[PDB]
């Protein structure tokens, strides 16, 4: 009754006015390990490995 | 047990009574078992096929 009536957000259900969700996590892009990028890499095939060196 | 038999004391001697008996013999199943534990490191690093060696 009267003229003041208007639909508010408090008048609608949580299924009428759902929040959007963003599936990407806000994260600092991961820096790699120093040694796993910088050092020389070899495949080992036992608990110990041995190599020749000049003396 | 086995049934006995008897000599009769002449004509109109009084005959005797006898019986046999049965019993039971049993066999019981018993269990023997063991567990062989080994680390994942030794299975990975070992030259020989270690589960097939122990079986």
d(CA A24, CA A22): 6
Chain A neighbors of B45, CB-CB under 8 A:
46-47
User: Nearest CA to B55 among B31, B30, B36?
Assistant: B36
Which technique was used to obtain these atomic coordinates? cryo-EM
Query: DSSP string covering A1-55, please?
Result: --S-----GGGS-TTTSPPP---S---PPPPPPHHHHHS------SS--------
d(CA B51, CA B44): 12
Give the tokens for residue B13.
């001697």
DSSP-derived 3-state class of residue B41: helix
Instruction: Tell me, in Å, the resolution of the deposited structure.
Output: 2.7
Chain B nearest-CA residue for A49: B45
Question: Nearest-CA distance from B36 to chain A in Å?
Answer: 22
Question: Nearest-CA distance from B35 to chain A in Å?
Answer: 26
d(CA B45, CA B55): 19
Residues with Cβ within 8 Å of B50's Cβ and at least 6 positions away in sequence, in order, are B38, B42, B43
């Amino acid at each position: 009754a009267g003229f003041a009536n208007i639909q508010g957000r408090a008048d609608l259900s949580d299924v009428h006015l759902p929040d959007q969700v963003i599936k990407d996590v806000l994260q600092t892009a991961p820096e790699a390990s120093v040694l796993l990028n910088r050092a020389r890499k070899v495949r080992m095939s036992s608990k110990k490995t041995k190599q020749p060196v000049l003396a | 047990s086995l049934p006995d038999a008897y000599w009769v004391d002449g004509d109109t001697g009084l005959k005797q009574t006898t019986k046999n008996i049965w019993s039971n013999v049993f066999m019981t199943a018993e269990e023997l078992a063991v567990i062989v534990p080994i680390p994942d490191a030794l299975i990975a690093d070992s030259d020989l096929p270690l589960w097939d060696e122990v079986k």
